């Protein structure tokens, strides 16, 4: 998810809007370096062949896509989870009313 979203943002910054679903499907059809090299080749090819479009990216249909992507990220992938590398890395931050964040043992 991290690398997919990174590449989708890299392509959105220049306006390429088909690259979004193309990257997602390239991913689904496919280690961590392995995923990065699979996606970064296509993303760099897009950002290079489709530059000159940083001025033509501030249009509706390019802002809706970025909005939706970042909103879905913040909404679905930032929940407390058991940690990948060490299975016991949930030092549960759990914030009370504003001005209060409490980590546990």
């Amino acid at each position: 998810v991290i690398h997919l979203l990174l590449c989708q943002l890299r392509v959105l910054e220049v306006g390429a809007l088909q690259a979004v679903y193309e990257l997602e499907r390239i991913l689904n059809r496919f280690s961590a370096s392995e995923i990065r090299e699979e996606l970064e080749q296509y993303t760099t090819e897009i950002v290079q062949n489709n530059l000159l479009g940083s001025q033509g990216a501030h249009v509706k249909n390019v802002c809706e896509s970025k909005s939706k992507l970042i909103a879905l990220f913040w909404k679905a992938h930032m929940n407390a989870k058991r940690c990948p590398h060490c299975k016991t890395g949930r030092s549960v931050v759990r914030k009370e009313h504003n001005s209060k964040l409490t980590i546990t043992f």
């Binding site: 306006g15 809007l17 088909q18 679903y21 499907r25 689904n28 059809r29 479009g53 033509g56 249009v59 509706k60 249909n61 390019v62």
Partner: protein, 199 residues
């Protein structure tokens, strides 16, 4: 014998869907009545059709009518094998209750090697394209979209959008990134023409 009425309606709708995509279909198939459908053909494996394309005679399509009311990954593989061996690329799977949810992402997983697509049976009982309010859609060719963008000084984004799951984008089998011309019959101007990028 209502199963036969449903089979006949679905077969007529699929013949119309295949003709609207530009496949070689005869007038009799498009004007076939029930009495002669049941005369010819009972089963759900001899309703499978294989159609050819106007151009690219190798480019043909294959319509399936699975028996399982809820098709699964194994059912999909069993005739993805048929397609891979008969040397076809496209398919069309008419399902009676739905596809188990893992199957939908499998059909998507099969790369342009073997591109499939599903249709519910209740979605084919009538041709939505023949509704009063539904305009005529026309998949533009790669050389007409360029002239459009050049005439209006547009970009491909910055054009109205049509969803890739739109009931009339799924029917005309339009992939993503394709522009479709739409001829709205307007009470004001007669035959207004619009364009929508499929995404």
């Amino acid at each position: 014998e209502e199963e036969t009425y449903r089979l006949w309606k679905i077969r007529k709708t699929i013949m119309q869907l295949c003709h609207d995509r530009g496949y070689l279909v005869t007038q009799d198939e498009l004007d076939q009545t029930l009495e002669e459908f049941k005369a010819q053909s009972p089963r759900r494996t001899d309703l499978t059709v294989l159609v050819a394309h106007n151009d690219d005679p190798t480019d043909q399509m294959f319509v399936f009518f699975p028996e399982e009311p809820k098709v699964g990954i194994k059912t999909i593989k069993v005739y993805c094998q048929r397609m891979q061996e008969e040397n076809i690329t496209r398919a069309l799977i008419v399902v009676q209750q739905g596809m188990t949810p893992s199957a939908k992402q499998s059909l998507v997983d099969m790369a342009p090697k073997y591109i499939l697509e599903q249709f519910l049976q209740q979605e084919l009982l009538i041709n939505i394209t023949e509704h009063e309010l539904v305009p005529e859609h026309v998949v533009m060719t790669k050389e007409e979209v360029t002239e459009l963008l050049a005439r209006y000084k547009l970009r491909e984004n910055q054009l109205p959008r049509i969803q890739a799951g739109d009931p009339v984008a799924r029917y005309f089998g339009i992939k993503r990134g394709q522009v479709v011309k739409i001829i709205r019959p307007s009470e004001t101007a007669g035959r207004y023409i619009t364009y929508r990028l499929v995404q």
